Amino acid sequence: KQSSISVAVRVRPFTEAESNRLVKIDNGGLRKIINVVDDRMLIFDPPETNPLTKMQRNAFPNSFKGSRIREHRFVFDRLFDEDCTQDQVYRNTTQPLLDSVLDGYNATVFAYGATGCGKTHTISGTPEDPGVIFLTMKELYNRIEELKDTKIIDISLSYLEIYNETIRDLLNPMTQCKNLVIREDANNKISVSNLSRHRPNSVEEVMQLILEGNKNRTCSPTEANATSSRSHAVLQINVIQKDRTGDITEEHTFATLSIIDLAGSERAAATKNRGARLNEGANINKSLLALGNCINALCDPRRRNHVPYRDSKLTRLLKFSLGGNCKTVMIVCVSPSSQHYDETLNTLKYADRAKEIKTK
Amino acid sequence: MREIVHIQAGQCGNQIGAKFWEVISDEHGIDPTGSYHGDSDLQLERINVYYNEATGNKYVPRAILVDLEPGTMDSVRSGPFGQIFRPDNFVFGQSGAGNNWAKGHYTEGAELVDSVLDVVRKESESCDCLQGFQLTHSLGGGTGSGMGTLLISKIREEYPDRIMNTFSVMPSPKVSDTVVEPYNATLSVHQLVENTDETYCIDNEALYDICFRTLKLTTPTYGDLNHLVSATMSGVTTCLRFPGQLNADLRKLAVNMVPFPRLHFFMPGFAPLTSRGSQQYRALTVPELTQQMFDSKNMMAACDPRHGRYLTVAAIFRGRMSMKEVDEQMLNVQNKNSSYFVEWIPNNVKTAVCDIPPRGLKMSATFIGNSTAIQELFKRISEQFTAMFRRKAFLHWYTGEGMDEMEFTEAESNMNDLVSEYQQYQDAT
Amino acid sequence: MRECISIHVGQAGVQIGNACWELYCLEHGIQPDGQMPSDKTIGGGDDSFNTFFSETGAGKHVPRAVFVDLEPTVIDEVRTGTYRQLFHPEQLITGKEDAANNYARGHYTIGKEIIDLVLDRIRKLADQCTGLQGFLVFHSFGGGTGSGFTSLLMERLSVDYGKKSKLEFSIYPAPQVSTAVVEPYNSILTTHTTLEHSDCAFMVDNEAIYDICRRNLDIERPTYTNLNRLISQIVSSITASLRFDGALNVDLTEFQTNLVPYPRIHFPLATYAPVISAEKAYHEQLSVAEITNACFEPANQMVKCDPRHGKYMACCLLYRGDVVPKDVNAAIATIKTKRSIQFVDWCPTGFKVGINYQPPTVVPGGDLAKVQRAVCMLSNTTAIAEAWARLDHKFDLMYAKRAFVHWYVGEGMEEGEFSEAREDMAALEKDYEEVGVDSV
Ligand SMILES: CC(=O)O[C@H]1C(=O)[C@@]2(C)[C@H]([C@H](OC(=O)c3ccccc3)[C@]3(O)C[C@H](OC(=O)[C@H](O)[C@@H](NC(=O)c4ccccc4)c4ccccc4)C(C)=C1C3(C)C)[C@]1(OC(C)=O)CO[C@@H]1C[C@@H]2O
Ligand SMILES: Nc1nc2c(ncn2[C@@H]2O[C@H](COP(=O)(O)OP(=O)(O)OP(=O)(O)O)[C@@H](O)[C@H]2O)c(=O)[nH]1
Ligand SMILES: Nc1nc2c(ncn2[C@@H]2O[C@H](COP(=O)(O)OP(=O)(O)O)[C@@H](O)[C@H]2O)c(=O)[nH]1
Numbered sequence A: 001k002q003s004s005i006s007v008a009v010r011v012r013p014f015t016e017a018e019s020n021r022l023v024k025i026d027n028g029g030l031r032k033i034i035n036v037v038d039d040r041m042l043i044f045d046p047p048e049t050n051p052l053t054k055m056q057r058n059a060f061p062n063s064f065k066g067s068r069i070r071e072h073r074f075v076f077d078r079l080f081d082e083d084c085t086q087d088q089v090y091r092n093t094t095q096p097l098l099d100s101v102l103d104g105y106n107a108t109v110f111a112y113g114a115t116g117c118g119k120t121h122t123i124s125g126t127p128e129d130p131g132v133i134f135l136t137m138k139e140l141y142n143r144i145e146e147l148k149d150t151k152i153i154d155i156s157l158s159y160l161e162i163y164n165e166t167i168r169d170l171l172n173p174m175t176q177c178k179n180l181v182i183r184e185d186a187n188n189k190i191s192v193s194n195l196s197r198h199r200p201n202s203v204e205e206v207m208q209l210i211l212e213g214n215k216n217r218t219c220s221p222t223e224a225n226a227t228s229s230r231s232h233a234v235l236q237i238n239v240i241q242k243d244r245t246g247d248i249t250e251e252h253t254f255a256t257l258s259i260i261d262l263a264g265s266e267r268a269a270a271t272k273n274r275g276a277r278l279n280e281g282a283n284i285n286k287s288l289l290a291l292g293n294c295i296n297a298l299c300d301p302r303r304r305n306h307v308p309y310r311d312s313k314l315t316r317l318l319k320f321s322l323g324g325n326c327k328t329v330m331i332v333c334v335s336p337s338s339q340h341y342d343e344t345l346n347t348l349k350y351a352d353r354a355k356e357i358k359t360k
Numbered sequence B: 001m002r003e004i005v006h007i008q009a010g011q012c013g014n015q016i017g018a019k020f021w022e023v024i025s026d027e028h029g030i031d032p033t034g035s036y037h038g039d040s041d042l043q044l045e046r047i048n049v050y051y052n053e054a055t056g057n058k059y060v061p062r063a064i065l066v067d068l069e070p071g072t073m074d075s076v077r078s079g080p081f082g083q084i085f086r087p088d089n090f091v092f093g094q095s096g097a098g099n100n101w102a103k104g105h106y107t108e109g110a111e112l113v114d115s116v117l118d119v120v121r122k123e124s125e126s127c128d129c130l131q132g133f134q135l136t137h138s139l140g141g142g143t144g145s146g147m148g149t150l151l152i153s154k155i156r157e158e159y160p161d162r163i164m165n166t167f168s169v170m171p172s173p174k175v176s177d178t179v180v181e182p183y184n185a186t187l188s189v190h191q192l193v194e195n196t197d198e199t200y201c202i203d204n205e206a207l208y209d210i211c212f213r214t215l216k217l218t219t220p221t222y223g224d225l226n227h228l229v230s231a232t233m234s235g236v237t238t239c240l241r242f243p244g245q246l247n248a249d250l251r252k253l254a255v256n257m258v259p260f261p262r263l264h265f266f267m268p269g270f271a272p273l274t275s276r277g278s279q280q281y282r283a284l285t286v287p288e289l290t291q292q293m294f295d296s297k298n299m300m301a302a303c304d305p306r307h308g309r310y311l312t313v314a315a316i317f318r319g320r321m322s323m324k325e326v327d328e329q330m331l332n333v334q335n336k337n338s339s340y341f342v343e344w345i346p347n348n349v350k351t352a353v354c355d356i357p358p359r360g361l362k363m364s365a366t367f368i369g370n371s372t373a374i375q376e377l378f379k380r381i382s383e384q385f386t387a388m389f390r391r392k393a394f395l396h397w398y399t400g401e402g403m404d405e406m407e408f409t410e411a412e413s414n415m416n417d418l419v420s421e422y423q424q425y426q427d428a429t
Numbered sequence C: 001m002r003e004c005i006s007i008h009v010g011q012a013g014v015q016i017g018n019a020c021w022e023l024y025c026l027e028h029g030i031q032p033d034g035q036m037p038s039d040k041t042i043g044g045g046d047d048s049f050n051t052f053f054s055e056t057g058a059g060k061h062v063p064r065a066v067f068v069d070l071e072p073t074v075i076d077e078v079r080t081g082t083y084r085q086l087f088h089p090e091q092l093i094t095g096k097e098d099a100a101n102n103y104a105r106g107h108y109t110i111g112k113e114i115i116d117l118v119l120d121r122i123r124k125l126a127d128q129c130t131g132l133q134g135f136l137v138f139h140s141f142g143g144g145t146g147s148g149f150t151s152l153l154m155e156r157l158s159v160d161y162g163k164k165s166k167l168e169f170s171i172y173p174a175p176q177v178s179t180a181v182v183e184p185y186n187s188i189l190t191t192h193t194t195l196e197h198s199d200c201a202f203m204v205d206n207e208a209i210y211d212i213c214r215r216n217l218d219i220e221r222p223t224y225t226n227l228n229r230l231i232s233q234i235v236s237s238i239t240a241s242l243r244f245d246g247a248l249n250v251d252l253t254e255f256q257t258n259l260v261p262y263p264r265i266h267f268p269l270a271t272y273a274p275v276i277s278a279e280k281a282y283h284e285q286l287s288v289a290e291i292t293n294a295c296f297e298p299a300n301q302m303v304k305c306d307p308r309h310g311k312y313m314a315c316c317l318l319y320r321g322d323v324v325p326k327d328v329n330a331a332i333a334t335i336k337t338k339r340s341i342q343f344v345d346w347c348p349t350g351f352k353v354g355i356n357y358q359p360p361t362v363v364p365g366g367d368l369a370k371v372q373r374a375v376c377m378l379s380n381t382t383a384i385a386e387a388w389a390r391l392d393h394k395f396d397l398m399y400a401k402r403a404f405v406h407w408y409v410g411e412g413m414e415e416g417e418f419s420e421a422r423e424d425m426a427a428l429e430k431d432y433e434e435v436g437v438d439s440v
């Protein structure tokens, strides 16, 4: 019935230039491929073209030049439309995670998407219209200030990256990768070694830390993307909570909120020169596969005997941040333009791997 | 062109490497002096895989001998084939590891690893196309385990895309000659599982059993154990050096045998093994090779395959033989013993055939299994490990070299996770 | 002049090519060193060999072939074998590792390091050609190079040439026997290439040829040489119309027009009737009727499938030797009278017939007996889909648990390309059902 892992897929709206240059064909082109049909269901590549009667008869056994129904029916735990605003996204996306975190349980949000689907707009936003992260941290600090009485709260911030199966600190650069090693504690705490910690006092400090870390993030120009991420960026907010006026003692609690950027999967064909740029991509692909092999394994009750956490650094870093005692969400960002068609298809079925809902 | 760099570490690794180079030199018709005195043109066709040319028509093996005491180096250099090796490749210290993994990994081996890696870089840069590496060592020992795993880690850091084979001697439960075998074996398996593509789990008990019951030798010595391991090592890379009907390099075997990136611990075997008296009483054919290969008593890892299920199998035949017979025999083995093969792999057997038999035999075959029964081996080590860790029997010899108990805990946890992963596929759906 | 460019990819393709070029050199009287003693003893100048060979100044004959492999062993064997002087020195090898039996390595990482050389040599051969009929591609579905590199090469050839015919002579994996663990992945990932880019794909599985050798040739322990020789005989029968004069000539364009009913339906089965040993060559007439009947037996099919389970959509019989058309007509009538052989209701004609006066040649040291008559049957039928279904099952048995997927995705491939291709094969299978339904 109830599962801790949920999938939310957001459809980007067509930009002004793209809309103007692609509508001409409707009235290259756009041929919107994503047609939402329900809040839990979308259709990829529908047969909504008005002049379709001439070769719809080929589907009937008359001429076998095309018979491959390319239309797909995808089911997800939540769909966000092109006109859905940032507040509508956040209210159904990360508020329960914040409730769980303040309760004392870990929470996790993944953000996945290829190039040009609006991942950065979704998670980071703009100064005029800030993203999901700003709303999340603002609500956190508002709730903490509301709950100042009878409870003491402390906030710790960490921001690292996984790159070629090595851990790097972004807020504290020029540290040897060998120094940073995962160390599972006896009390189920991942506790990466020699990781810098920061104690921001407001959302502005948090965003300053985020920008400083992103300045150090690993990136290379590839394909049509001038700046393409080559690493999985992990932000961790540790909320430590104890009693103020009540049982003043050493006993306390602490939980973690994880916000995890996932470099998109890449077909090497796009990379010709290849080289180091080919190896990173390979590792990225492997990492993504490992993550899938966890999430699906966490959704199928049968395969709960053993979840393959050790297959990658990312999955091991989240050993106790995906199970039933932690609320996990995944924000899959896609684009309805045809220019990204194949990529979007791949992305959708990645989102389909979390829970293979056969029923349409 | 598809060239392998061989590294020898520790006493066991050096001895197996010396016997292996003797066998390989005999196969390619190389004298101990390094000159070629063969009687077939195919021997020199792909001799660059293991040997580098030298001016006066000489062939120096691409070997890298490593140790932390000079005794084994003096023994090898004074052997029958000692003069063939390059003198500059003998890298050694003066103070031994003393059967201590920490000394070989942190204190003593950290000094010599730079020199060994310098020689490794010099050997690898001269290669036209490097297929991968090949390490021989024992995990229950001192210098061997620590230096081998440190070299594996650093070469993997330096050559991430190349193959990293390994021929490890797993400590036996019964044949024991070192008190601190569990700590060394656990701390070595903690590193091998992360930094290798293939790991052939050899054990002295299985080799002693093969010598006693199959070969019917009254007084086995380490020379015979090295002989068996050498036959396995030669048979693994037979398709790199000679032509055949189905060629299969190291990467092809790794692709066809490793379903998931952590399950890469194998069970080797060599088919045509018989006593001298009983040679004339058997007809050497492909069915006999298959029957001896899949027999549980011919394994070199001392893990009963009947206690688990074969995730994958590879058979590398040598000699002139029919493909129909080979395919029929492999299909028959899979069908008759279906309980010992996982259901979610319709064909569990990779097959390769080379048309040049090993010198003195009409035909031969090498078996490389990958089954869940290997987990039992780790379980045994784990038992001994915990038996020494709840009381910390010999731990002060390790922490005195700068190690921490958290490293021991992490190694134990990783071995347990590997055991659980193999258990997850011993049962299936 | 009519030409045909042969391309051989992988170990299987190269060995089949060795058999094919041995057979062609035997057929045309060309010695292994490229010289033709007939032209010097008599004078020559009235012979037909340009379909496969190019003639230089000094009387040397260079075959129109391009041998391709990602490792040097097989090409090195060819470079030092009996036919070392026959081929041009441009037998292309990657000076690196093989594809390690996965589609991604041969299609994206290492395949793109020799594609330029292959395309350049094919361009040179095409420029030398005057009346290029098409390409004959030999490879293996279940392998590495033979799948991925073949896919890349045929993508490039479709982009460049486009209007030329392309014929696959592939080695489909058998139902039970298999010489590798990841054959289904490579075979399914080659669906796109064999469907969209090819024009006619001839599949042969090793189990059927093994059974044919055991039953008909009385060879208990056959090697790949026998299989390659049978495939070479079939290809020679297909291409004989371009080379030797005959009563009813059938070139490739005709073969495809009469065989392929729809663009996606281009997967025929191939059979060769008088496969028989010299000892059993006696005690039998081996007339036209006998060989024509033997072509239709389900045991003689070289793909492990039963034509009795499906409907024959088209057939092309190519006869060689002492044959008269009236016997062929009588044999076709005898076949049409039978009820066990079912034909679709929308192909009343059914049969294409070609006859050639050149009898088949016997390779020295071979197993096939010298015969006066022979026939090659090329049958487009719906039963082949059953074989595909078996392969699909195997794919699912690995893809549920994502076994071996990390190897593929770690070399440039993305995950979705798996499922996509499974859906392609599904659609192809659905088509082979829909064609088989009776007209309403
Ligand atoms: C006269 C003769 O041929 O007799 C055989 C023989 O009796 C048997 C018993 C041989 C013999 O093997 C042993 O006695 C033995 C003892 C301990 C460990 C391993 C082997 C033989 O020594 C071994 C020897 O093997 C070879 O010649 C191979 O080429 C073998 N050679 C070496 O390993 C080698 C080692 C050092 C120096 C030179 C060669 C080989 C195997 C794989 C890859 C390369 C080479 C063979 C056939 C025989 C004798 C001589 C009795 C057997 O071994 C091999 C490797 O063939 C034992 O199982 C086979 C079955 C053979 O019938
Ligand atoms: N009919 C026939 N099939 C062969 C022959 N040799 C190999 N095969 C088939 O080829 C398939 C695999 O291809 P490979 O022989 O490994 O050659 P490849 O396709 O280039 O793959 P690589 O090993 O990466 O080079 C096997 O399943 C065999 O059944 C042959 O001589 N005749
Ligand atoms: N096969 C074989 N095994 C050996 C040999 N010498 C030692 N061993 C095994 O290796 C283990 C001891 O490791 P050792 O070689 O001393 O490690 P090192 O001191 O670091 O070189 C024991 O369990 C032995 O069974 C040998 O010559 N041949």
Ligand SMILES: [Mg+2]
Pocket: C069, C070, C071, C072, C073, C074, C075
């Ligand atoms: Mg080759």
